[PDB]
Coordinates of C-alpha atoms in Angstrom, one line a residue:
Chain A
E678 CA -26.7 -10.5 -54.0
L679 CA -23.8 -8.2 -55.1
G680 CA -23.0 -4.8 -53.8
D681 CA -23.1 -5.8 -50.2
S682 CA -20.3 -5.0 -47.7
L683 CA -17.9 -7.7 -46.5
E684 CA -19.7 -7.7 -43.1
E685 CA -23.1 -8.1 -44.7
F686 CA -21.8 -10.9 -46.9
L687 CA -20.3 -12.8 -44.1
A688 CA -23.5 -12.7 -42.1
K689 CA -25.1 -14.5 -45.0
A690 CA -22.3 -16.8 -45.7
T691 CA -21.7 -18.3 -42.3
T692 CA -23.3 -18.7 -38.9
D693 CA -19.9 -18.6 -37.4
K694 CA -19.5 -15.1 -36.1
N695 CA -16.0 -15.8 -34.9
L696 CA -14.8 -16.7 -38.4
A697 CA -16.6 -13.6 -39.8
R698 CA -14.7 -11.5 -37.1
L699 CA -11.4 -13.0 -38.1
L700 CA -12.0 -12.3 -41.9
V701 CA -13.0 -8.6 -41.1
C702 CA -9.9 -8.2 -39.0
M703 CA -7.7 -9.6 -41.8
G704 CA -9.5 -7.2 -44.3
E705 CA -8.2 -4.2 -42.1
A706 CA -4.7 -5.5 -42.4
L707 CA -5.1 -5.8 -46.1
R708 CA -6.4 -2.3 -46.5
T709 CA -3.3 -1.0 -44.5
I710 CA -0.9 -3.1 -46.5
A711 CA -2.3 -1.8 -49.8
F712 CA -1.6 1.8 -48.7
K713 CA 1.9 0.9 -47.4
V714 CA 2.8 -0.6 -50.7
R715 CA 1.3 2.3 -52.7
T716 CA 3.8 4.8 -51.4
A717 CA 6.7 2.6 -50.3
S718 CA 10.2 3.9 -50.9
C719 CA 11.9 1.6 -53.3
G720 CA 15.7 1.4 -53.3
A721 CA 18.5 -0.7 -54.6
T722 CA 17.8 -3.5 -52.1
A723 CA 14.3 -3.3 -50.7
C724 CA 11.0 -1.3 -50.8
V725 CA 10.2 0.1 -47.4
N726 CA 7.6 1.9 -45.4
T727 CA 7.0 2.4 -41.6
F728 CA 5.2 0.4 -39.0
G729 CA 4.7 2.7 -36.1
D730 CA 8.1 4.3 -35.4
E731 CA 10.0 1.8 -37.4
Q732 CA 11.1 1.4 -41.1
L733 CA 10.5 -2.0 -42.5
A734 CA 10.7 -3.8 -45.9
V735 CA 7.1 -4.2 -47.1
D736 CA 7.0 -7.9 -46.7
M737 CA 8.0 -7.6 -43.1
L738 CA 5.6 -4.8 -42.6
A739 CA 2.8 -6.9 -44.0
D740 CA 3.8 -9.8 -41.7
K741 CA 3.5 -7.4 -38.7
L742 CA 0.2 -6.1 -39.7
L743 CA -1.2 -9.6 -40.3
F744 CA 0.0 -10.9 -36.9
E745 CA -1.5 -7.8 -35.3
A746 CA -4.9 -8.4 -37.0
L747 CA -4.9 -12.1 -35.8
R748 CA -4.2 -11.0 -32.2
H749 CA -6.9 -8.2 -32.3
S750 CA -9.4 -10.8 -33.5
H751 CA -9.1 -12.8 -30.2
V752 CA -10.1 -15.9 -32.3
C753 CA -6.7 -17.1 -33.3
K754 CA -4.7 -19.6 -31.4
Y755 CA -1.6 -20.1 -33.6
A756 CA -0.4 -18.2 -36.6
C757 CA 2.5 -19.1 -38.9
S758 CA 4.0 -16.9 -41.5
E759 CA 5.9 -18.2 -44.5
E760 CA 8.8 -15.8 -43.3
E761 CA 9.3 -17.5 -40.0
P762 CA 7.3 -20.6 -39.9
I763 CA 7.4 -21.2 -36.2
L764 CA 4.0 -21.2 -34.7
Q765 CA 3.2 -18.0 -32.7
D766 CA 0.5 -17.8 -30.1
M767 CA -2.0 -15.0 -30.9
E768 CA -3.6 -15.3 -27.5
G769 CA -7.1 -16.2 -28.7
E770 CA -9.0 -19.4 -29.5
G771 CA -10.9 -20.8 -32.4
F772 CA -8.7 -20.9 -35.5
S773 CA -5.1 -21.2 -36.6
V774 CA -3.9 -19.3 -39.6
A775 CA -1.0 -19.7 -42.1
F776 CA -0.1 -16.8 -44.4
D777 CA 2.3 -15.7 -47.1
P778 CA 2.4 -12.0 -46.2
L779 CA 3.5 -10.5 -49.5
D780 CA 4.0 -12.8 -52.5
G781 CA 5.9 -10.8 -55.1
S782 CA 7.6 -8.5 -52.5
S783 CA 10.8 -8.6 -54.5
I784 CA 9.2 -7.1 -57.5
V785 CA 7.1 -4.3 -55.9
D786 CA 9.6 -1.9 -57.5
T787 CA 8.6 -3.2 -60.9
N788 CA 5.0 -2.2 -60.2
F789 CA 3.5 -5.6 -61.0
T790 CA 0.6 -6.8 -58.9
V791 CA 1.5 -8.4 -55.6
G792 CA -0.6 -10.1 -52.9
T793 CA -1.2 -11.8 -49.5
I794 CA -2.4 -15.3 -49.2
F795 CA -3.9 -17.0 -46.1
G796 CA -5.7 -20.1 -44.9
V797 CA -7.9 -20.5 -41.9
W798 CA -8.2 -23.8 -40.0
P799 CA -10.4 -24.5 -37.0
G800 CA -8.5 -25.6 -34.0
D801 CA -4.9 -25.4 -32.9
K802 CA -2.8 -27.3 -35.5
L803 CA -1.1 -26.2 -38.7
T804 CA 0.5 -29.6 -39.3
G805 CA -1.2 -33.0 -39.7
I806 CA -4.0 -31.1 -41.5
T807 CA -5.2 -30.9 -45.1
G808 CA -6.5 -28.0 -47.2
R809 CA -9.9 -29.5 -47.2
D810 CA -10.1 -28.9 -43.5
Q811 CA -9.9 -25.1 -43.9
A812 CA -12.8 -23.0 -42.7
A813 CA -11.9 -20.3 -45.2
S814 CA -9.1 -19.0 -47.4
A815 CA -8.4 -15.7 -48.9
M816 CA -6.1 -13.4 -50.8
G817 CA -5.4 -9.7 -50.8
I818 CA -4.5 -8.4 -54.2
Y819 CA -2.5 -5.1 -54.5
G820 CA -2.8 -4.0 -58.1
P821 CA -4.2 -0.9 -59.7
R822 CA -7.3 -1.9 -57.6
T823 CA -7.2 -3.4 -54.1
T824 CA -9.3 -6.6 -53.9
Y825 CA -10.0 -9.2 -51.2
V826 CA -11.0 -12.6 -52.6
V827 CA -12.6 -15.0 -50.1
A828 CA -13.8 -18.6 -50.1
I829 CA -15.9 -19.9 -47.1
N830 CA -15.7 -23.7 -47.1
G831 CA -19.2 -25.1 -47.3
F832 CA -20.8 -21.9 -48.8
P833 CA -20.9 -21.6 -52.7
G834 CA -18.5 -19.6 -54.8
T835 CA -15.4 -17.5 -54.5
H836 CA -16.1 -13.9 -53.8
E837 CA -14.3 -10.8 -54.8
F838 CA -14.5 -7.6 -52.7
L839 CA -13.3 -4.2 -54.0
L840 CA -11.7 -1.7 -51.7
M841 CA -13.7 1.6 -52.0
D842 CA -12.5 5.1 -51.6
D843 CA -14.2 5.3 -48.1
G844 CA -12.5 2.2 -46.8
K845 CA -15.4 -0.3 -47.3
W846 CA -15.0 -3.7 -49.0
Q847 CA -17.8 -4.1 -51.5
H848 CA -18.9 -7.5 -53.0
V849 CA -18.3 -7.2 -56.7
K850 CA -18.1 -10.7 -58.1
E851 CA -18.9 -14.3 -57.4
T852 CA -17.3 -17.2 -59.3
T853 CA -18.8 -20.6 -59.3
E854 CA -17.6 -22.2 -62.5
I855 CA -14.2 -22.2 -64.3
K856 CA -14.8 -22.8 -68.0
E857 CA -12.5 -24.0 -70.7
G858 CA -10.4 -21.4 -72.4
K859 CA -7.0 -20.6 -74.0
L860 CA -4.9 -19.0 -71.2
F861 CA -1.9 -20.5 -69.6
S862 CA 0.4 -19.4 -66.7
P863 CA 3.5 -21.6 -66.7
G864 CA 5.6 -21.6 -63.6
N865 CA 9.2 -22.9 -63.5
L866 CA 9.3 -22.9 -67.4
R867 CA 13.0 -23.7 -67.1
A868 CA 11.9 -27.2 -66.1
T869 CA 10.8 -28.0 -69.6
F870 CA 14.5 -28.2 -70.6
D871 CA 14.9 -31.5 -68.8
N872 CA 11.3 -32.6 -68.2
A873 CA 10.1 -33.8 -71.6
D874 CA 6.5 -34.3 -70.3
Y875 CA 6.3 -30.6 -69.1
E876 CA 7.8 -29.6 -72.4
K877 CA 5.1 -31.6 -74.3
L878 CA 2.4 -29.8 -72.2
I879 CA 3.8 -26.3 -72.9
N880 CA 4.1 -27.2 -76.6
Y881 CA 0.5 -28.0 -76.7
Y882 CA -0.5 -24.6 -75.3
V883 CA 1.8 -22.9 -77.9
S884 CA 0.5 -25.0 -80.7
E885 CA -3.1 -24.1 -79.8
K886 CA -2.3 -20.4 -79.7
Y887 CA -3.0 -19.9 -76.0
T888 CA -2.5 -16.5 -74.4
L889 CA 0.5 -16.4 -71.9
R890 CA 0.2 -14.4 -68.6
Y891 CA 2.7 -15.2 -65.9
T892 CA 4.4 -12.8 -63.3
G893 CA 5.9 -15.4 -61.0
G894 CA 3.5 -14.2 -58.2
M895 CA 1.0 -16.8 -57.2
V896 CA -1.6 -14.3 -56.3
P897 CA -2.1 -12.6 -59.5
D898 CA -1.2 -15.7 -61.6
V899 CA -4.0 -17.7 -59.9
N900 CA -6.5 -14.9 -59.4
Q901 CA -6.7 -14.4 -63.1
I902 CA -8.3 -17.8 -63.4
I903 CA -10.9 -16.9 -60.9
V904 CA -11.6 -13.6 -62.6
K905 CA -11.6 -14.7 -66.2
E906 CA -13.3 -18.0 -65.2
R907 CA -10.9 -20.0 -67.4
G908 CA -7.2 -20.9 -67.6
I909 CA -4.5 -23.2 -66.3
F910 CA -1.7 -22.4 -64.0
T911 CA 1.2 -24.9 -63.6
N912 CA 4.4 -25.2 -61.6
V913 CA 6.3 -28.4 -62.3
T914 CA 9.8 -29.7 -61.0
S915 CA 12.6 -31.3 -62.9
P916 CA 15.6 -33.4 -61.7
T917 CA 17.7 -30.2 -61.6
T918 CA 15.0 -27.8 -60.3
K919 CA 13.3 -28.1 -56.9
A920 CA 9.8 -27.1 -55.5
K921 CA 9.5 -23.5 -54.4
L922 CA 5.8 -23.6 -53.6
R923 CA 4.7 -24.2 -50.0
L924 CA 1.7 -26.4 -49.4
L925 CA 0.6 -24.8 -46.1
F926 CA 1.0 -21.1 -46.9
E927 CA 0.2 -20.9 -50.5
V928 CA -0.9 -24.0 -52.3
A929 CA -3.7 -25.3 -49.9
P930 CA -5.3 -21.8 -49.5
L931 CA -5.3 -21.2 -53.2
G932 CA -6.7 -24.7 -53.7
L933 CA -9.7 -23.8 -51.7
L934 CA -10.2 -20.5 -53.7
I935 CA -10.0 -22.4 -57.0
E936 CA -12.1 -25.3 -56.0
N937 CA -14.8 -23.1 -54.4
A938 CA -14.8 -21.2 -57.8
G939 CA -15.6 -24.5 -59.7
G940 CA -12.1 -25.2 -60.7
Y941 CA -9.8 -28.0 -60.1
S942 CA -6.4 -28.5 -58.5
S943 CA -3.7 -31.2 -58.8
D944 CA -0.4 -32.2 -57.6
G945 CA -0.3 -34.7 -60.6
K946 CA -2.4 -37.3 -58.9
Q947 CA -4.9 -35.7 -56.4
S948 CA -6.5 -32.5 -55.3
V949 CA -4.1 -30.3 -53.4
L950 CA -6.7 -30.1 -50.7
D951 CA -6.1 -33.8 -49.8
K952 CA -2.5 -33.5 -49.1
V953 CA -1.4 -33.6 -45.5
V954 CA 0.9 -30.9 -44.3
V955 CA 3.5 -32.9 -42.4
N956 CA 5.9 -30.1 -41.9
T957 CA 5.3 -26.3 -42.4
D958 CA 8.0 -26.2 -45.1
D959 CA 6.5 -28.9 -47.2
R960 CA 6.7 -28.1 -50.9
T961 CA 4.7 -29.3 -53.8
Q962 CA 4.2 -28.9 -57.5
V963 CA 0.7 -27.8 -58.5
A964 CA -1.8 -27.0 -61.2
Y965 CA -4.9 -25.0 -61.0
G966 CA -7.6 -24.5 -63.6
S967 CA -10.5 -25.8 -65.6
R968 CA -11.5 -29.4 -65.6
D969 CA -10.2 -30.4 -69.0
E970 CA -6.9 -28.6 -68.5
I971 CA -6.3 -30.4 -65.2
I972 CA -7.1 -33.8 -66.9
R973 CA -4.5 -32.8 -69.5
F974 CA -2.0 -31.8 -66.9
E975 CA -2.4 -35.2 -65.2
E976 CA -2.4 -37.3 -68.4
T977 CA 0.5 -35.5 -69.9
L978 CA 2.8 -35.6 -66.9
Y979 CA 1.8 -38.9 -65.3
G980 CA 0.0 -40.8 -68.2
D981 CA -3.2 -41.5 -66.3
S982 CA -5.6 -38.8 -64.9
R983 CA -7.2 -39.6 -61.5
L984 CA -9.5 -36.7 -62.1
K985 CA -10.7 -38.2 -65.3
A986 CA -11.2 -41.6 -63.7
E987 CA -13.0 -39.9 -60.8
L988 CA -15.4 -38.2 -63.1
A989 CA -16.1 -41.3 -65.2
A990 CA -17.5 -43.0 -62.0
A991 CA -19.9 -40.2 -61.0
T992 CA -21.2 -40.7 -64.5
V993 CA -21.9 -44.4 -64.5
Chain B
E732 CA 19.5 14.1 -57.9
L733 CA 16.2 12.5 -56.7
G734 CA 13.3 13.8 -54.6
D735 CA 12.5 16.6 -56.9
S736 CA 8.9 17.3 -58.1
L737 CA 8.1 16.7 -61.8
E738 CA 8.2 20.4 -62.4
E739 CA 11.6 20.8 -60.7
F740 CA 13.0 17.9 -62.8
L741 CA 11.6 19.3 -66.0
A742 CA 13.2 22.7 -65.3
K743 CA 16.6 20.9 -65.1
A744 CA 16.0 18.6 -68.0
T745 CA 14.8 21.1 -70.7
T746 CA 14.7 24.7 -71.4
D747 CA 11.5 24.1 -73.4
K748 CA 8.7 25.5 -71.2
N749 CA 6.1 24.3 -73.7
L750 CA 7.3 20.7 -73.5
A751 CA 7.2 21.0 -69.7
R752 CA 3.7 22.2 -69.7
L753 CA 2.6 19.3 -71.9
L754 CA 4.3 16.7 -69.7
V755 CA 2.7 18.3 -66.6
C756 CA -0.7 18.2 -68.2
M757 CA -0.2 14.6 -69.2
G758 CA 0.8 13.7 -65.7
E759 CA -2.5 15.0 -64.4
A760 CA -4.4 12.8 -66.9
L761 CA -2.4 9.9 -65.7
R762 CA -3.2 10.7 -62.1
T763 CA -6.9 10.7 -63.0
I764 CA -6.8 7.6 -65.0
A765 CA -5.2 5.8 -62.1
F766 CA -8.1 6.8 -59.9
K767 CA -10.7 5.8 -62.5
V768 CA -9.1 2.3 -62.8
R769 CA -8.8 1.9 -59.0
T770 CA -12.5 2.6 -58.6
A771 CA -13.9 1.2 -61.8
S772 CA -17.0 -1.1 -61.8
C773 CA -16.0 -4.3 -63.4
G774 CA -19.2 -6.1 -64.6
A775 CA -20.1 -8.9 -66.9
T776 CA -18.8 -7.2 -70.0
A777 CA -16.6 -4.2 -69.2
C778 CA -14.8 -2.2 -66.5
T779 CA -16.4 1.2 -66.3
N780 CA -16.2 4.6 -64.7
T781 CA -17.4 8.2 -65.1
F782 CA -16.2 11.0 -67.3
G783 CA -18.4 14.1 -66.8
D784 CA -22.0 13.0 -67.4
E785 CA -21.0 9.7 -69.2
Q786 CA -20.1 6.2 -68.0
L787 CA -17.5 4.7 -70.3
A788 CA -15.3 1.6 -70.4
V789 CA -11.9 2.6 -68.8
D790 CA -9.9 2.5 -72.1
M791 CA -12.3 5.0 -73.7
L792 CA -12.4 7.0 -70.5
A793 CA -8.6 7.2 -70.5
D794 CA -8.7 8.2 -74.2
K795 CA -11.0 11.1 -73.4
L796 CA -8.9 12.2 -70.5
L797 CA -5.7 12.3 -72.6
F798 CA -7.3 14.3 -75.4
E799 CA -8.7 16.7 -72.8
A800 CA -5.2 17.1 -71.3
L801 CA -3.7 17.8 -74.6
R802 CA -6.3 20.4 -75.5
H803 CA -5.8 22.0 -72.0
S804 CA -2.1 22.2 -72.6
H805 CA -2.5 24.6 -75.5
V806 CA 0.7 23.3 -76.9
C807 CA -0.5 20.4 -79.0
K808 CA -1.5 20.7 -82.7
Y809 CA -2.4 17.1 -83.5
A810 CA -3.1 14.1 -81.3
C811 CA -3.6 10.5 -82.4
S812 CA -4.9 7.6 -80.3
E813 CA -4.4 4.0 -81.0
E814 CA -8.2 3.6 -80.4
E815 CA -9.0 5.5 -83.6
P816 CA -5.8 6.4 -85.4
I817 CA -6.8 9.6 -87.3
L818 CA -5.2 12.9 -86.5
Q819 CA -7.3 15.2 -84.3
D820 CA -6.7 18.9 -84.0
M821 CA -6.1 19.8 -80.3
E822 CA -6.3 23.6 -81.1
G823 CA -2.8 24.3 -79.9
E824 CA 0.7 24.7 -81.3
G825 CA 4.0 23.2 -80.7
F826 CA 3.9 19.4 -80.5
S827 CA 1.9 16.4 -81.9
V828 CA 1.3 13.5 -79.6
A829 CA 0.5 9.8 -80.2
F830 CA -0.8 7.6 -77.5
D831 CA -2.1 4.2 -76.4
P832 CA -4.5 5.2 -73.7
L833 CA -4.8 2.0 -71.7
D834 CA -2.6 -0.9 -72.6
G835 CA -4.0 -3.9 -71.0
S836 CA -7.5 -2.5 -70.6
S837 CA -9.2 -5.9 -71.2
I838 CA -7.5 -7.3 -68.1
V839 CA -8.3 -4.6 -65.6
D840 CA -10.8 -7.0 -64.0
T841 CA -7.8 -9.3 -63.2
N842 CA -6.2 -6.6 -61.2
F843 CA -2.9 -6.9 -63.2
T844 CA -0.9 -3.7 -63.8
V845 CA -1.9 -1.7 -66.9
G846 CA -0.6 1.5 -68.4
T847 CA -0.6 4.4 -70.8
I848 CA 2.1 5.1 -73.4
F849 CA 2.8 8.3 -75.4
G850 CA 5.3 10.0 -77.6
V851 CA 5.8 13.7 -78.1
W852 CA 7.1 15.1 -81.5
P853 CA 7.8 18.8 -82.2
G854 CA 5.7 20.1 -85.0
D855 CA 2.5 19.1 -86.8
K856 CA 3.1 15.6 -88.2
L857 CA 2.8 12.1 -86.9
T858 CA 3.7 10.4 -90.2
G859 CA 7.0 10.7 -92.1
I860 CA 8.7 10.9 -88.7
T861 CA 10.9 8.6 -86.7
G862 CA 11.1 7.8 -83.0
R863 CA 14.4 9.5 -82.9
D864 CA 12.7 12.8 -83.6
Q865 CA 10.6 12.6 -80.4
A866 CA 11.1 15.5 -77.9
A867 CA 10.0 13.1 -75.1
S868 CA 8.2 9.9 -74.4
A869 CA 6.5 8.5 -71.3
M870 CA 4.4 5.8 -69.7
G871 CA 2.0 5.9 -66.9
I872 CA 2.0 2.7 -64.9
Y873 CA -1.2 1.7 -62.9
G874 CA 0.0 -1.0 -60.5
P875 CA 0.0 -1.3 -56.7
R876 CA 2.0 2.0 -57.1
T877 CA 1.2 4.8 -59.6
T878 CA 4.3 5.8 -61.6
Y879 CA 5.1 8.1 -64.5
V880 CA 8.3 7.2 -66.4
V881 CA 9.7 9.9 -68.6
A882 CA 12.6 10.3 -71.1
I883 CA 13.5 13.7 -72.4
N884 CA 15.4 13.2 -75.7
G885 CA 18.8 14.8 -75.4
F886 CA 18.9 14.7 -71.6
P887 CA 20.4 11.8 -69.8
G888 CA 18.5 8.9 -68.3
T889 CA 15.0 7.6 -67.9
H890 CA 13.2 9.0 -64.9
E891 CA 10.6 7.4 -62.7
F892 CA 8.1 9.5 -60.7
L893 CA 6.0 8.1 -57.9
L894 CA 2.5 9.5 -57.2
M895 CA 2.4 10.5 -53.6
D896 CA -0.6 10.7 -51.4
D897 CA -0.8 14.4 -51.7
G898 CA -1.4 13.9 -55.4
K899 CA 2.1 15.1 -56.5
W900 CA 4.7 13.4 -58.6
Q901 CA 8.1 12.8 -56.9
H902 CA 11.3 11.8 -58.7
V903 CA 12.3 8.4 -57.3
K904 CA 14.7 6.7 -59.8
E905 CA 17.0 7.6 -62.7
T906 CA 18.1 4.7 -65.0
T907 CA 21.2 5.0 -67.2
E908 CA 22.4 1.4 -67.6
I909 CA 20.7 -1.9 -68.6
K910 CA 23.0 -4.8 -67.6
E911 CA 23.0 -8.4 -68.5
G912 CA 20.7 -10.7 -66.7
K913 CA 18.6 -13.8 -66.9
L914 CA 15.0 -12.4 -67.4
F915 CA 12.8 -12.7 -70.6
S916 CA 9.4 -11.4 -71.5
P917 CA 8.2 -13.2 -74.7
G918 CA 5.3 -11.6 -76.5
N919 CA 3.4 -13.6 -79.1
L920 CA 4.9 -16.9 -77.9
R921 CA 2.4 -18.7 -80.2
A922 CA 4.6 -17.6 -83.1
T923 CA 7.2 -20.2 -81.9
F924 CA 4.9 -22.8 -83.4
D925 CA 5.7 -21.7 -86.9
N926 CA 8.7 -19.3 -86.7
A927 CA 11.7 -21.6 -86.1
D928 CA 14.0 -18.6 -85.3
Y929 CA 11.8 -17.5 -82.5
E930 CA 11.5 -21.0 -81.2
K931 CA 15.3 -21.2 -81.0
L932 CA 15.6 -18.0 -79.2
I933 CA 13.1 -19.2 -76.5
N934 CA 15.0 -22.5 -76.3
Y935 CA 18.1 -20.5 -75.5
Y936 CA 16.4 -18.6 -72.6
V937 CA 14.9 -21.9 -71.2
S938 CA 18.3 -23.6 -71.5
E939 CA 19.9 -20.8 -69.5
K940 CA 17.2 -21.2 -66.8
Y941 CA 15.9 -17.6 -67.3
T942 CA 13.1 -16.2 -65.2
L943 CA 9.8 -15.6 -67.3
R944 CA 7.7 -12.4 -66.6
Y945 CA 5.1 -11.5 -69.2
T946 CA 1.5 -10.2 -68.9
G947 CA 0.6 -9.2 -72.4
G948 CA 0.8 -5.6 -71.5
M949 CA 3.8 -3.8 -73.2
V950 CA 3.9 -1.3 -70.3
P951 CA 4.7 -3.4 -67.3
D952 CA 6.6 -5.9 -69.5
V953 CA 9.0 -3.2 -70.7
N954 CA 9.0 -1.1 -67.6
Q955 CA 10.4 -4.0 -65.6
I956 CA 13.6 -3.8 -67.7
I957 CA 14.2 -0.3 -66.8
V958 CA 13.4 -0.9 -63.1
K959 CA 15.6 -4.0 -62.8
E960 CA 18.2 -2.8 -65.2
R961 CA 18.2 -6.1 -67.0
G962 CA 16.1 -8.3 -69.3
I963 CA 14.8 -8.8 -72.7
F964 CA 11.3 -8.3 -74.2
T965 CA 10.5 -9.7 -77.5
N966 CA 7.5 -9.8 -79.9
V967 CA 8.1 -11.7 -83.2
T968 CA 5.6 -12.5 -85.9
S969 CA 5.0 -15.7 -87.9
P970 CA 3.2 -16.4 -91.1
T971 CA 0.0 -17.3 -89.2
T972 CA 0.2 -14.5 -86.7
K973 CA -0.2 -10.7 -87.2
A974 CA 2.0 -8.0 -85.8
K975 CA -0.1 -6.4 -83.1
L976 CA 2.3 -3.8 -81.8
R977 CA 2.0 -0.3 -83.3
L978 CA 5.2 1.7 -84.2
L979 CA 3.8 5.1 -83.6
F980 CA 1.7 4.6 -80.4
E981 CA 3.8 2.1 -78.5
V982 CA 7.0 0.9 -80.0
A983 CA 8.8 4.2 -80.8
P984 CA 7.8 5.8 -77.4
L985 CA 9.0 2.7 -75.5
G986 CA 12.2 2.7 -77.7
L987 CA 13.1 6.1 -76.4
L988 CA 12.5 5.1 -72.8
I989 CA 14.7 2.0 -73.2
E990 CA 17.5 3.7 -75.1
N991 CA 17.6 6.6 -72.7
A992 CA 17.9 4.0 -69.9
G993 CA 21.0 2.6 -71.5
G994 CA 19.3 -0.3 -73.3
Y995 CA 18.8 -1.1 -76.9
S996 CA 15.8 -1.7 -79.2
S997 CA 15.6 -3.6 -82.5
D998 CA 13.2 -4.6 -85.2
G999 CA 15.8 -7.2 -86.1
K1000 CA 17.9 -4.8 -88.2
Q1001 CA 17.9 -1.3 -86.7
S1002 CA 16.8 0.7 -83.6
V1003 CA 13.1 1.1 -83.6
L1004 CA 13.9 4.8 -83.3
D1005 CA 15.1 4.9 -87.0
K1006 CA 11.9 3.4 -88.5
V1007 CA 9.8 5.8 -90.5
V1008 CA 6.1 5.9 -89.5
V1009 CA 4.5 5.8 -92.9
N1010 CA 0.9 5.3 -91.8
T1011 CA -0.4 5.9 -88.2
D1012 CA -1.4 2.3 -87.6
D1013 CA 1.9 0.7 -89.0
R1014 CA 3.0 -2.4 -87.0
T1015 CA 6.4 -3.9 -86.2
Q1016 CA 8.1 -6.7 -84.4
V1017 CA 10.4 -5.6 -81.7
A1018 CA 12.9 -6.4 -78.9
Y1019 CA 14.1 -4.3 -76.1
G1020 CA 16.8 -5.2 -73.7
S1021 CA 20.4 -5.3 -72.8
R1022 CA 23.2 -5.1 -75.3
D1023 CA 24.0 -8.8 -75.5
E1024 CA 20.4 -9.8 -75.6
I1025 CA 19.7 -7.5 -78.5
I1026 CA 22.8 -8.8 -80.4
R1027 CA 21.5 -12.3 -79.8
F1028 CA 18.0 -11.4 -81.1
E1029 CA 19.4 -9.8 -84.2
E1030 CA 21.8 -12.8 -84.9
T1031 CA 19.0 -15.3 -84.3
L1032 CA 16.8 -13.6 -87.0
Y1033 CA 19.6 -12.8 -89.5
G1034 CA 22.9 -14.3 -88.5
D1035 CA 24.5 -10.9 -88.2
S1036 CA 23.7 -8.1 -85.8
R1037 CA 23.8 -4.5 -87.0
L1038 CA 24.0 -3.5 -83.3
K1039 CA 27.2 -5.5 -82.8
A1040 CA 28.7 -3.8 -85.9
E1041 CA 27.7 -0.3 -84.7
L1042 CA 29.2 -0.8 -81.3
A1043 CA 32.4 -2.1 -83.0
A1044 CA 32.6 0.8 -85.4
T1045 CA 32.6 3.2 -82.5
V1046 CA 35.2 1.1 -80.5

């Protein structure tokens, strides 16, 4: 079924009413964020709007709104934001949540799509956990449309909801397979200058006349894969460059969205969903995309693909 | 001064009340297009919404809104859309307008920023003209914010208007300088496979650790230069790749926006504003950006930069 509301969908997708309540609460925060971004005041140094009687940069505004939603749910024990990665007690029980409140906040003024990412874990820990342990993950996407993209672990597909004029979130798409195509989204392209293996990968994409779409914002750049049902996103390090992407706040949540969509993730060797978060600031390189492009990523950077070898053993 | 309405700005920017009427009418089309995109139904094959009694894909919907706005203005003789590049008589007098109704329409479903581009020429022709002859040019930008970016030829600056919640356009930025920075937006990157000059140019940017920002969509990709006051957009052809960008509907309009903002444009040899549109669907390579980036682009393609010589001949 499509065309159902987020509440109706969640009743079908999970027996866990507390997880559904948390995802509805977070949808209200996303709706409010989208409106605060839509008529923010953008200046030399920041884009701002108000939270109550105060004026706040939109990323901080988003952070407040998300903590407030988690507290209102009553089903959150700890929340952690990528802004201030200390664990905050949200005075509830059931789940702990890590979020990146506004990926792309620095380029709101340019009017490119920006977004929110969050992962939901059962229990009271946001370290010593893996992405595979998430109950759900989701993104809010603030573009010419406002969408809310959700994966419930253990229930098929990644599901897109459109914000309607009357405030409701309507189920508009389900993705269950990522196919092979000719789209690439190359993060940290500068690394090709001194990582010859990344350069070789990029050169392959260019030689095969792939389409380039990359904004530097993880939300849109990975959402496009889910929507188009094809593509490859990469973000690779070099000796001289370092890893910007956080496992807990960004990479694990997105990994669930991609893998629930029938895509694959990699850090070079393994699914990003099998990496333990040791510390909340832990960084990683990553790729997301179709099967063959992930094998290519792994073979080109590290010679051998574990994904390929994994597949060759479910075959035999 | 900022905070003024579109109408207040236009009364300061030009004495031409007919040009102002046209630009206000177009702003209302842009406001409507933004809504149609925001609420479109994106299905298996298209993103669709309503126009009167019809459901239409959003690019075609935008096309109809823009022709309707031009007819309603009473001040447009001919209009030409990139979707069907023939002249259409809008039953008015004063200006002829060329437009690209929805740049990026095929990626609406991805929720990436998309936009409208148009140029406004006095009189009755849209061929045998140059970009420099425009009265004005503008883009509508459909992102998480809805903006209308306007240049009035002969009046300083490029001017950004934000759509407020009350449905009105408010002046929020004037750009008059484009500085040097480390941002590139490389269109047609596939051409580096078999255009060694473009390959070298991209090497340069990568060697200097530039930030990449490109979504296929001329509008956001060029708008970011105006907003950040830095950067370089390029689109260069190779023997195995066509030139996709149209001079009339896209490149000349955006040239006026960039040059009014204190940047520069180039086809490799000259401002895009000096190229004659011979046929409505004529194509061109292009770059837009800061002074030094445009000099580099020209030297990369030809060894010498006509821009560099021009700037010297004045200094």
